[PDB]
Design a binder for this molecule. Structure first.
Ligand SMILES: CC[C@H]1OC(=O)[C@H](C)C(=O)[C@H](C)[C@@H](O[C@@H]2O[C@H](C)C[C@H](N(C)C)[C@H]2O)[C@](C)(OC)C[C@@H](C)C(=O)[C@H](C)[C@H]2N(CCCCn3cnc(-c4cccnc4)c3)C(=O)O[C@]12C
Ligand SMILES: [Mg+2]
Ligand SMILES: [Mg+2]
Ligand SMILES: [Mg+2]
Ligand SMILES: [Mg+2]
Ligand SMILES: [Mg+2]
Ligand SMILES: [Mg+2]
Ligand SMILES: [Mg+2]
Ligand SMILES: [Mg+2]
Ligand SMILES: [Mg+2]
Ligand SMILES: [Mg+2]
Ligand SMILES: [Mg+2]
Ligand SMILES: [Mg+2]
Ligand SMILES: [Mg+2]
Ligand SMILES: [Mg+2]
Ligand SMILES: [Mg+2]
Ligand SMILES: [Mg+2]
Ligand SMILES: [Mg+2]
Ligand SMILES: [Mg+2]
Ligand SMILES: [Mg+2]
Ligand SMILES: [Mg+2]
Ligand SMILES: [Mg+2]
Ligand SMILES: [Mg+2]
Ligand SMILES: [Mg+2]
Ligand SMILES: [Mg+2]
Ligand SMILES: [Mg+2]
Ligand SMILES: [Mg+2]
Ligand SMILES: [Mg+2]
Ligand SMILES: [Mg+2]
Ligand SMILES: [Mg+2]
Ligand SMILES: [Mg+2]
Ligand SMILES: [Mg+2]
Ligand SMILES: [Mg+2]
Ligand SMILES: [Mg+2]
Ligand SMILES: [Mg+2]
Ligand SMILES: [Mg+2]
Ligand SMILES: [Mg+2]
Ligand SMILES: [Mg+2]
Ligand SMILES: [Mg+2]
Ligand SMILES: [Mg+2]
Ligand SMILES: [Mg+2]
Ligand SMILES: [Mg+2]
Ligand SMILES: [Mg+2]
Ligand SMILES: [Mg+2]
Ligand SMILES: [Mg+2]
Ligand SMILES: [Mg+2]
Ligand SMILES: [Mg+2]
Ligand SMILES: [Mg+2]
Ligand SMILES: [Mg+2]
Ligand SMILES: [Mg+2]
Ligand SMILES: [Mg+2]
Ligand SMILES: [Mg+2]
Ligand SMILES: [Mg+2]
Ligand SMILES: [Mg+2]
Ligand SMILES: [Mg+2]
Ligand SMILES: [Mg+2]
Ligand SMILES: [Mg+2]
Ligand SMILES: [Mg+2]
Ligand SMILES: [Mg+2]
Ligand SMILES: [Mg+2]
Ligand SMILES: [Mg+2]
Ligand SMILES: [Mg+2]
Ligand SMILES: [Mg+2]
Ligand SMILES: [Mg+2]
Ligand SMILES: [Mg+2]
Ligand SMILES: [Mg+2]
Ligand SMILES: [Mg+2]
Ligand SMILES: [Mg+2]
Ligand SMILES: [Mg+2]
Ligand SMILES: [Mg+2]
Ligand SMILES: [Mg+2]
Ligand SMILES: [Mg+2]
Ligand SMILES: [Mg+2]
Ligand SMILES: [Mg+2]
Ligand SMILES: [Mg+2]
Ligand SMILES: [Mg+2]
Ligand SMILES: [Mg+2]
Ligand SMILES: [Mg+2]
Ligand SMILES: [Mg+2]
Ligand SMILES: [Mg+2]
Ligand SMILES: [Mg+2]
Ligand SMILES: [Mg+2]
Ligand SMILES: [Mg+2]
Ligand SMILES: [Mg+2]
Ligand SMILES: [Mg+2]
Ligand SMILES: [Mg+2]
Ligand SMILES: [Mg+2]
Ligand SMILES: [Mg+2]
Ligand SMILES: [Mg+2]
Ligand SMILES: [Mg+2]
Ligand SMILES: [Mg+2]
Ligand SMILES: [Mg+2]
Ligand SMILES: [Mg+2]
Ligand SMILES: [Mg+2]
Ligand SMILES: [Mg+2]
Ligand SMILES: [Mg+2]
Ligand SMILES: [Mg+2]
Ligand SMILES: [Mg+2]
Ligand SMILES: [Mg+2]
Ligand SMILES: [Mg+2]
Ligand SMILES: [Mg+2]
Ligand SMILES: [Mg+2]
Ligand SMILES: [Mg+2]
Ligand SMILES: [Mg+2]
Ligand SMILES: [Mg+2]
Ligand SMILES: [Mg+2]
Ligand SMILES: [Mg+2]
Ligand SMILES: [Mg+2]
Ligand SMILES: [Mg+2]
Ligand SMILES: [Mg+2]
Ligand SMILES: [Mg+2]
Ligand SMILES: [Mg+2]
Ligand SMILES: [Mg+2]
Ligand SMILES: [Mg+2]
Ligand SMILES: [Mg+2]
Ligand SMILES: [Mg+2]
Ligand SMILES: [Mg+2]
Ligand SMILES: [Mg+2]
Ligand SMILES: [Mg+2]
Ligand SMILES: [Mg+2]
Ligand SMILES: [Mg+2]
Ligand SMILES: [Mg+2]
Ligand SMILES: [Mg+2]
Ligand SMILES: [Mg+2]
Ligand SMILES: [Mg+2]
Ligand SMILES: [Mg+2]
Ligand SMILES: [Mg+2]
Ligand SMILES: [Mg+2]
Ligand SMILES: [Mg+2]
Ligand SMILES: [Mg+2]
Ligand SMILES: [Mg+2]
Ligand SMILES: [Mg+2]
Ligand SMILES: [Mg+2]
Ligand SMILES: [Mg+2]
Ligand SMILES: [Mg+2]
Ligand SMILES: [Mg+2]
Ligand SMILES: [Mg+2]
Ligand SMILES: [Mg+2]
Ligand SMILES: [Mg+2]
Ligand SMILES: [Mg+2]
Ligand SMILES: [Mg+2]
Ligand SMILES: [Mg+2]
Ligand SMILES: [Mg+2]
Ligand SMILES: [Mg+2]
Ligand SMILES: [Mg+2]
Ligand SMILES: [Mg+2]
Ligand SMILES: [Mg+2]
Ligand SMILES: [Mg+2]
Ligand SMILES: [Mg+2]
Ligand SMILES: [Mg+2]
Ligand SMILES: [Mg+2]
Ligand SMILES: [Mg+2]
Ligand SMILES: [Mg+2]
Ligand SMILES: [Mg+2]
Ligand SMILES: [Mg+2]
Ligand SMILES: [Mg+2]
Ligand SMILES: [Mg+2]
Ligand SMILES: [Mg+2]
Ligand SMILES: [Mg+2]
Ligand SMILES: [Mg+2]
Ligand SMILES: [Mg+2]
Ligand SMILES: [Mg+2]
Ligand SMILES: [Mg+2]
Ligand SMILES: [Mg+2]
Ligand SMILES: [Mg+2]
Ligand SMILES: [Mg+2]
Ligand SMILES: [Mg+2]
Ligand SMILES: [Mg+2]
Ligand SMILES: [Mg+2]
Ligand SMILES: [Mg+2]
Ligand SMILES: [Mg+2]
Ligand SMILES: [Mg+2]
Ligand SMILES: [Mg+2]
Ligand SMILES: [Mg+2]
Ligand SMILES: [Mg+2]
Ligand SMILES: [Mg+2]
Ligand SMILES: [Mg+2]
Ligand SMILES: [Mg+2]
Ligand SMILES: [Mg+2]
Ligand SMILES: [Mg+2]
Ligand SMILES: [Mg+2]
Ligand SMILES: [Mg+2]
Ligand SMILES: [Mg+2]
Ligand SMILES: [Mg+2]
Ligand SMILES: [Mg+2]
Ligand SMILES: [Mg+2]
Ligand SMILES: [Mg+2]
Ligand SMILES: [Mg+2]
Ligand SMILES: [Mg+2]
Ligand SMILES: [Mg+2]
Ligand SMILES: [Mg+2]
Ligand SMILES: [Mg+2]
Ligand SMILES: [Mg+2]
Ligand SMILES: [Mg+2]
Ligand SMILES: [Mg+2]
Ligand SMILES: [Mg+2]
Ligand SMILES: [Mg+2]
Ligand SMILES: [Mg+2]
Ligand SMILES: [Mg+2]
Ligand SMILES: [Mg+2]
Ligand SMILES: [Mg+2]
Ligand SMILES: [Mg+2]
Ligand SMILES: [Mg+2]
Ligand SMILES: [Mg+2]
Ligand SMILES: [Mg+2]
Ligand SMILES: [Mg+2]
Ligand SMILES: [Mg+2]
Ligand SMILES: [Mg+2]
Ligand SMILES: [Mg+2]
Ligand SMILES: [Mg+2]
Ligand SMILES: [Mg+2]
Ligand SMILES: [Mg+2]
Ligand SMILES: [Mg+2]
Ligand SMILES: [Mg+2]
Ligand SMILES: [Mg+2]
Ligand SMILES: [Mg+2]
Ligand SMILES: [Mg+2]
Ligand SMILES: [Mg+2]
Ligand SMILES: [Mg+2]
Ligand SMILES: [Mg+2]
Ligand SMILES: [Mg+2]
Ligand SMILES: [Mg+2]
Ligand SMILES: [Mg+2]
Ligand SMILES: [Mg+2]
Ligand SMILES: [Mg+2]
Ligand SMILES: [Mg+2]
Ligand SMILES: [Mg+2]
Ligand SMILES: [Mg+2]
Ligand SMILES: [Mg+2]
Ligand SMILES: [Mg+2]
Ligand SMILES: [Mg+2]
Ligand SMILES: [Mg+2]
Ligand SMILES: [Mg+2]
Ligand SMILES: [Zn+2]
Lengths: 118, 59, 131, 204, 122
RNA sequence: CGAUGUCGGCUCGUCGCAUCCUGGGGCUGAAGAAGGUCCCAAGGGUUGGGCUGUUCGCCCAUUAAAGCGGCACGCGAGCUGGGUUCAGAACGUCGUGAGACAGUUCGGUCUCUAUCCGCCACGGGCGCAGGAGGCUUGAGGGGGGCUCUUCCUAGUACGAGAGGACCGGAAGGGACGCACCUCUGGUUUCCCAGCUGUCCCUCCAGGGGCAUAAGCUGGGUAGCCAUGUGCGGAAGGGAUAACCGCUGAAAGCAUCUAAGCGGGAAGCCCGCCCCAAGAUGAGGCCUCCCACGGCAGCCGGUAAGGACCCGGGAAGACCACCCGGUGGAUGGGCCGGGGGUGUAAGCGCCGCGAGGCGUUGAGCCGACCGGUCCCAAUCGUCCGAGGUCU
RNA sequence: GAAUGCCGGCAUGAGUAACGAUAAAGAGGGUGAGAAUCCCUCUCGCCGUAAGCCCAAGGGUUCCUACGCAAUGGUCGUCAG
RNA sequence: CGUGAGGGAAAGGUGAAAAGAACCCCGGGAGGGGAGUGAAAUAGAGCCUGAAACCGUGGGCUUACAAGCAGUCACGGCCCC
């Protein structure tokens, strides 16, 4: 049973899964768009939306909170200065997942794109 | 345990009857409204990069 | 439908608002309606609040005292009709929500760990100055 | 016999005569009568009740005709109460009063594929003293050459729950008609939001 | 929530200090005794020259439990020890004094003398 | 004997009845209460522990009772491996000896993958003469079935007394079963906080990794849960067993019987709960579609509808089932509430300092209860009646 | 036609068990007919009295570079002992 | 294979003549389709003949209420000559 349990496991123990989300966040925030598997793409939305939403608040506390996950001061600086301002009037939904047509050859994996919204 | 083992060779009939559920189902495909190419529903079109009426990626 | 709101609605007939706010580590006196033989009476239970278990109407709190060489804990529904009144006897300052660790402490060690909460003793005395 | 369709909303407890009373709260009515079952037409007596209004778009034509014939707005659920013929054309929570006893039918919570210990309360095996990969196993399932087989109905692992269950003789603790609410003392099958059926009890 | 093997403190002045439950006297196979239930116990420790001595097979009513006791008013009570008072076959206390508080459940279950000896009834 | 694994235990049952208990009886050297003996009865029940490898048995504490047997002395492709019965070693004993006993003593490899039948669960197919969406009848199955104490009747009947009822009526239990999570109590692998060592970011401050597949520790929501909560065993109707009769011959009397009628068990049928029309004997009711082209058959396009795909779900191994798909609150975000943690950072002030105080119940914040189209369920596709004969 | 015969071929079990340490991965760029698996960059994790470095046995070209991917590699392969 | 003494395989055939398939086409290649050679190409080099087990594709009859050492006897239906 899994009744009313939220959150995928992705066959990673607790610290590997956390490092998966952080690493994917750095990549999404760096390039604006990444291709990954559908299940990972779905999980990445909420993780990154929260860091973007903290970047919209702008205060020092939010910057230190975000650094806990992103670590890279220059990346956080881009998130606070360039990324967050274009979402001032957008309330949630800062990321978009769309599914790709071709599966990965070596293992059949369904793939999807994740990206920041305009 | 004590190494269970098949008691009799499976007949051609019984082998192939077990396989009565093995035929693949064809991939479901819809036309892309932009370039008319066949492609799976709910995916970005791989021939022209359109989805939901706009261009999403370079093809 | 809003299931949470119907439940709160059912509970609305039974919520109390007359009782004073308290924290784990405060010392409290519970005047409690008790049935014996053949009458019913009010019995006071005074002790340290070691636990407040919140759930709206269903929150409960646990008070701990020593009675004649024996530790006793009583668990009380915060909105029980059998509670006549609760009197704050003393404000203690804890550092955590659950004070189970005092079950293993000497009387001296407890007094050392739950010192008087001057901030809330002052705030209690500032209030209590009414029209 | 009387009954009503309902939704299990949640549990709490009330205080009554200085006693805490655990209750399950049920949003029961209102239930329009949609079809009556008569001995002449159907060979038995019952009333098909409806429950919860439905977005008419989602109502196909055979269902639409069914609701039309007994001039009734479109409803999400049809269930019959056997041997019940209410005088009116709408069944509400007021068919029960505080103090009555009711039976409640729900769909129990689904355990999925359940082991022999969870489903049947088997004792399993020892966890030390040499026990070898059988800590939750069922043990023997038979004898030897006589009878050389396993009984029908032998208790084994498998799907457990998400099944019809009736709990009997529950006390009605309160009725709140302004909210179509029924307060039933104790536990009722299934999850919050689950469809339930509340009927007058069969225990004398 | 007492069972065979459980040690209990002796809340009286019989001479016993520790008893070990060997039986819950509640039907043919009750698993546990709670406050107000009677047990059969071996006396495992006693002060010299008491009414009871080590090895005696005695009866006692449970007066305090470390497993909290639920009450119909929705409250509960819990003590720091498991304690019993040694009785005779009339449910009468064999000692003359009772030490520490006792569960109010004793009253309705018929141990009026033990309840009135106790310094507090909770 | 080209192998049918052995004692005992554990696990899981199931059956017999020569019945241990509970239910119904007759006889008694049956006053009552308690027994004894036989009859009917297998529905349910039949405890925990000390000793010993033990089965058995003895003992302790209870109990309504602590039944006895069968199932390859039931059950090792289910577990154990204490006993016994390979190789080591020793004792007693026998033998000149090598060795031996069934005597004793310490030790001593129990094999991941189930093909068929069978069993528990779950799909796919076709069928149920037209095709569909609903709601149902219950043939037939299954589940369940235990019992004690106290009080009233009444200290009455009975008895010198001790003691102490029937019938009838209350209350409260034990164990067991089903469901549940309000409370009590768990867990809660990252929801919060504190802590050590080390390395790092960025020097301070503030943080991050690692110390487990949570580094450790104090807590902990939803869920899943029992130690927690609700409820169940019936009631009632019918037919019986032993047993007791009514009327009554054969047989002027007598006889429960030969004609006929009555009473009478926890047991039998039904009643309760669950499955159930593949019940091919394929049932019933409500509603929807329709007489389409070309050549009881065929080809194609549609109808009522259905499937695919997608967002999901206290549903779930998969599949199934159920909800939703912009005509939308389905998941994700965001917002509010609940809930947890327990007063963040930064700044100010006191202190040489570790720290402390204020801002501040602050900050953070999974799942729970809701709101909100910000993000995503785009766009679509494919099946699908034309109704045989008397 | 049988010798648990001999040699060879081909079936069944079955798309089943397994793919050999639970130190762990993610993304971007490149190459190419083809890329989870090759090269490059960033991030993450693991060893660090070693899972780093040197020598002796033993092995015998496995070393370096270019061109290759039928087979060998437990998948893949443009890579490679 | 075995430290070693020692053990110890499997594996023959295009055609008369290489005339061993230029060139084009799909394919990265492998492979194939044409062209062409040959009396013959299911003689195309994985090559004479090419059995059997075993695996496919197409067609006829048959099968989802049925009890089976699988056949045999009978009758009937459908298909073929
Ligand atoms: C552990 C696996 C073994 O099974 C058992 O051991 C099993 C538990 C049995 O005992 C089995 C049931 C036996 O049959 C019984 O024989 C009896 C005499 C009669 C019985 N009757 C009931 C018929 C019959 O059932 C017998 C004879 O096995 C010896 C079967 C016989 C065919 C075998 O010899 C057989 C091939 C065994 N073997 C020799 C083991 C040598 C010793 N070894 C043990 N462990 C290791 C080891 C190696 C490496 C690492 N760790 C450990 C080595 C293996 O390599 O594998 C075995 C199957
Ligand atoms: Mg489940
Ligand atoms: Mg699990
Ligand atoms: Mg969800
Ligand atoms: Mg999940
Ligand atoms: Mg997580
Ligand atoms: Mg998931
Ligand atoms: Mg995982
Ligand atoms: Mg995996
Ligand atoms: Mg992994
Ligand atoms: Mg983990
Ligand atoms: Mg870790
Ligand atoms: Mg890690
Ligand atoms: Mg979140
Ligand atoms: Mg998509
Ligand atoms: Mg796809
Ligand atoms: Mg690949
Ligand atoms: Mg085994
Ligand atoms: Mg075995
Ligand atoms: Mg096996
Ligand atoms: Mg094993
Ligand atoms: Mg095996
Ligand atoms: Mg076999
Ligand atoms: Mg074959
Ligand atoms: Mg075949
Ligand atoms: Mg088969
Ligand atoms: Mg192109
Ligand atoms: Mg609620
Ligand atoms: Mg409301
Ligand atoms: Mg008092
Ligand atoms: Mg104290
Ligand atoms: Mg009052
Ligand atoms: Mg239901
Ligand atoms: Mg199990
Ligand atoms: Mg269990
Ligand atoms: Mg169960
Ligand atoms: Mg067990
Ligand atoms: Mg266990
Ligand atoms: Mg054990
Ligand atoms: Mg073992
Ligand atoms: Mg184990
Ligand atoms: Mg087993
Ligand atoms: Mg056997
Ligand atoms: Mg048989
Ligand atoms: Mg199910
Ligand atoms: Mg009320
Ligand atoms: Mg629920
Ligand atoms: Mg004491
Ligand atoms: Mg002594
Ligand atoms: Mg033999
Ligand atoms: Mg053999
Ligand atoms: Mg044999
Ligand atoms: Mg054999
Ligand atoms: Mg024997
Ligand atoms: Mg038996
Ligand atoms: Mg008999
Ligand atoms: Mg009897
Ligand atoms: Mg009797
Ligand atoms: Mg008598
Ligand atoms: Mg007598
Ligand atoms: Mg007498
Ligand atoms: Mg008798
Ligand atoms: Mg007799
Ligand atoms: Mg008799
Ligand atoms: Mg019986
Ligand atoms: Mg039986
Ligand atoms: Mg029996
Ligand atoms: Mg012992
Ligand atoms: Mg001992
Ligand atoms: Mg024992
Ligand atoms: Mg014994
Ligand atoms: Mg022993
Ligand atoms: Mg013996
Ligand atoms: Mg003896
Ligand atoms: Mg007794
Ligand atoms: Mg008796
Ligand atoms: Mg015993
Ligand atoms: Mg036997
Ligand atoms: Mg025998
Ligand atoms: Mg024998
Ligand atoms: Mg046996
Ligand atoms: Mg036996
Ligand atoms: Mg056996
Ligand atoms: Mg074995
Ligand atoms: Mg055995
Ligand atoms: Mg066996
Ligand atoms: Mg076997
Ligand atoms: Mg077996
Ligand atoms: Mg066997
Ligand atoms: Mg054993
Ligand atoms: Mg042994
Ligand atoms: Mg031994
Ligand atoms: Mg012995
Ligand atoms: Mg032996
Ligand atoms: Mg041997
Ligand atoms: Mg030996
Ligand atoms: Mg010796
Ligand atoms: Mg000697
Ligand atoms: Mg001899
Ligand atoms: Mg001898
Ligand atoms: Mg001699
Ligand atoms: Mg000698
Ligand atoms: Mg011999
Ligand atoms: Mg011997
Ligand atoms: Mg010896
Ligand atoms: Mg040893
Ligand atoms: Mg031995
Ligand atoms: Mg031995
Ligand atoms: Mg083993
Ligand atoms: Mg063996
Ligand atoms: Mg084996
Ligand atoms: Mg396998
Ligand atoms: Mg099988
Ligand atoms: Mg078979
Ligand atoms: Mg199907
Ligand atoms: Mg089906
Ligand atoms: Mg039936
Ligand atoms: Mg049948
Ligand atoms: Mg039945
Ligand atoms: Mg009386
Ligand atoms: Mg008299
Ligand atoms: Mg009575
Ligand atoms: Mg009862
Ligand atoms: Mg809750
Ligand atoms: Mg809880
Ligand atoms: Mg709670
Ligand atoms: Mg709790
Ligand atoms: Mg805890
Ligand atoms: Mg966290
Ligand atoms: Mg650190
Ligand atoms: Mg640096
Ligand atoms: Mg620092
Ligand atoms: Mg590191
Ligand atoms: Mg490390
Ligand atoms: Mg680690
Ligand atoms: Mg940590
Ligand atoms: Mg620590
Ligand atoms: Mg913890
Ligand atoms: Mg929780
Ligand atoms: Mg329980
Ligand atoms: Mg009960
Ligand atoms: Mg007469
Ligand atoms: Mg005569
Ligand atoms: Mg007659
Ligand atoms: Mg009669
Ligand atoms: Mg009669
Ligand atoms: Mg009579
Ligand atoms: Mg009768
Ligand atoms: Mg009964
Ligand atoms: Mg049904
Ligand atoms: Mg049907
Ligand atoms: Mg049906
Ligand atoms: Mg039949
Ligand atoms: Mg039908
Ligand atoms: Mg019908
Ligand atoms: Mg349509
Ligand atoms: Mg449906
Ligand atoms: Mg749908
Ligand atoms: Mg659509
Ligand atoms: Mg739309
Ligand atoms: Mg939504
Ligand atoms: Mg939402
Ligand atoms: Mg929220
Ligand atoms: Mg809040
Ligand atoms: Mg709060
Ligand atoms: Mg502060
Ligand atoms: Mg601060
Ligand atoms: Mg200063
Ligand atoms: Mg200060
Ligand atoms: Mg919040
Ligand atoms: Mg939108
Ligand atoms: Mg709206
Ligand atoms: Mg389309
Ligand atoms: Mg021959
Ligand atoms: Mg053979
Ligand atoms: Mg062979
Ligand atoms: Mg053989
Ligand atoms: Mg051979
Ligand atoms: Mg041969
Ligand atoms: Mg051979
Ligand atoms: Mg061969
Ligand atoms: Mg094969
Ligand atoms: Mg083979
Ligand atoms: Mg498969
Ligand atoms: Mg298999
Ligand atoms: Mg498998
Ligand atoms: Mg596998
Ligand atoms: Mg492995
Ligand atoms: Mg591996
Ligand atoms: Mg690339
Ligand atoms: Mg790449
Ligand atoms: Mg690759
Ligand atoms: Mg590749
Ligand atoms: Mg590289
Ligand atoms: Mg070092
Ligand atoms: Mg070499
Ligand atoms: Mg070199
Ligand atoms: Mg080289
Ligand atoms: Mg190299
Ligand atoms: Mg190269
Ligand atoms: Mg290669
Ligand atoms: Mg290759
Ligand atoms: Mg290749
Ligand atoms: Mg290879
Ligand atoms: Mg390869
Ligand atoms: Mg390999
Ligand atoms: Mg290349
Ligand atoms: Mg290589
Ligand atoms: Mg050799
Ligand atoms: Mg060699
Ligand atoms: Mg040789
Ligand atoms: Mg040769
Ligand atoms: Mg030639
Ligand atoms: Mg030649
Ligand atoms: Mg020639
Ligand atoms: Mg090419
Ligand atoms: Mg080309
Ligand atoms: Mg070529
Ligand atoms: Mg070709
Ligand atoms: Mg060619
Ligand atoms: Mg030619
Ligand atoms: Mg010729
Ligand atoms: Mg030829
Ligand atoms: Mg030829
Ligand atoms: Mg020739
Ligand atoms: Mg040839
Ligand atoms: Mg050939
Ligand atoms: Mg051939
Ligand atoms: Mg064919
Ligand atoms: Mg039939
Ligand atoms: Mg047929
Ligand atoms: Mg025949
Ligand atoms: Mg004939
Ligand atoms: Zn397109």
């Amino acid at each position: 049973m899994r009744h009313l349990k939220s959150g995928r496991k992705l066959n990673r123990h607790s610290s590997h899964r956390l490092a998966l989300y952080r690493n994917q966040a750095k990549s999404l925030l760096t390039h604006g768009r990444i291709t990954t598997t559908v299940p990972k793409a779905k999980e990445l939305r909420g993780f990154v939306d929260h860091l973007i939403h903290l970047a919209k608040r702008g205060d020092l506390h939010a910057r230190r909170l975000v650094l806990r996950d992103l670590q890279d001061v220059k990346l956080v600086r881009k998130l606070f200065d360039e990324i967050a301002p274009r979402y001032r009037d957008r309330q949630g939904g800062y990321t978009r997942v769309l599914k790709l047509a071709e599966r990965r050859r070596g293992d059949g994996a369904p793939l999807a794109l994740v990206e920041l919204v305009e | 345990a004590k190494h269970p083992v098949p008691k009799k060779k499976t007949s051609k009939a019984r082998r192939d009857a077990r396989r009565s559920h093995h035929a693949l189902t064809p991939p479901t495909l819809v036309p892309c409204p932009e370039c008319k190419a066949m492609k799976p529903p709910h995916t970005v079109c791989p021939e022209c990069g359109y989805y939901a009426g706009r261009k999403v990626l370079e093809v | 439908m809003n299931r949470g709101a119907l439940i709160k609605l059912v509970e609305s007939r039974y919520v109390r608002t007359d009782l004073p706010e308290f924290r784990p580590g405060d010392t409290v006196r519970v005047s409690y309606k008790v049935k014996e033989g053949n009458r019913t009476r009010i019995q006071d239970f005074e002790g340290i609040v070691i636990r407040i278990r919140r759930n709206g109407f269903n929150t409960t709190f646990t008070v701990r005292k020593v009675s004649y060489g024996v530790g006793v804990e009583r668990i009380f529904p915060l909105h029980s009709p059998l509670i006549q009144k609760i009197d704050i006897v003393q404000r203690g300052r804890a550092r955590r929500a659950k004070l189970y660790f005092i079950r293993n402490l000497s009387d001296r060690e407890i007094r050392r760990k739950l010192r008087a909460d001057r901030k809330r003793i002052d705030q209690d005395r500032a209030a209590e100055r009414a029209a | 016999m009387k009954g009503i369709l309902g939704v299990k909303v949640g549990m709490t407890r009330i205080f009554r005569d200085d006693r805490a009373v655990p209750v399950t709260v049920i949003l029961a009515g209102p239930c329009p009568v949609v079809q009556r079952r008569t001995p002449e037409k159907d060979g038995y007596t019952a009333v098909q009740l409806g429950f919860l209004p439905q977005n008419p778009k989602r109502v196909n034509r055979p269902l639409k005709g069914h609701f039309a014939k007994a001039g009734v707005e479109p409803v999400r659920i049809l269930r019959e109460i056997r041997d019940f013929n209410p005088e009116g054309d709408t069944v509400t929570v007021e068919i029960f009063k505080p103090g009555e006893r009711v039976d409640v039918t729900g769909t129990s919570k689904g355990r999925g594929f359940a082991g022999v210990m969870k489903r049947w309360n088997f004792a399993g095996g020892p966890d030390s003293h040499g026990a070898h990969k059988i800590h939750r196993h069922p043990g023997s399932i038979g004898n030897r050459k006589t009878p050389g087989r396993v009984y029908k109905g032998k208790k084994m692992a498998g799907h457990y729950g998400a099944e019809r269950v009736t709990v009997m003789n529950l006390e009605v603790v309160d009725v709140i008609p302004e909210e179509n609410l029924l307060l039933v003392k104790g536990a009722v099958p299934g999850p919050n939001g689950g469809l339930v059926i509340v009927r007058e009890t069969k225990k004398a | 929530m007492i069972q065979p093997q459980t040690y209990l403190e002796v809340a009286d002045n019989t001479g016993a200090r520790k008893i070990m439950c060997i039986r819950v006297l509640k039907g043919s196979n009750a698993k546990y005794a709670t406050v107000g239930d009677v047990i059969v116990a071996s006396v495992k420790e006693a002060i010299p020259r008491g009414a009871v001595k080590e090895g005696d097979v005695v009866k006692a009513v449970v007066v305090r439990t470390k497993k909290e006791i639920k009450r119909p008013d929705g409250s509960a009570i819990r003590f720091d020890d498991n304690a019993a008072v040694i009785i005779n076959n009339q449910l009468e206390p064999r000692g003359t004094r009772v030490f520490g508080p006792v569960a109010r459940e004793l009253r309705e279950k018929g141990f009026m003398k033990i309840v009135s000896l106790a310094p507090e009834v909770l």
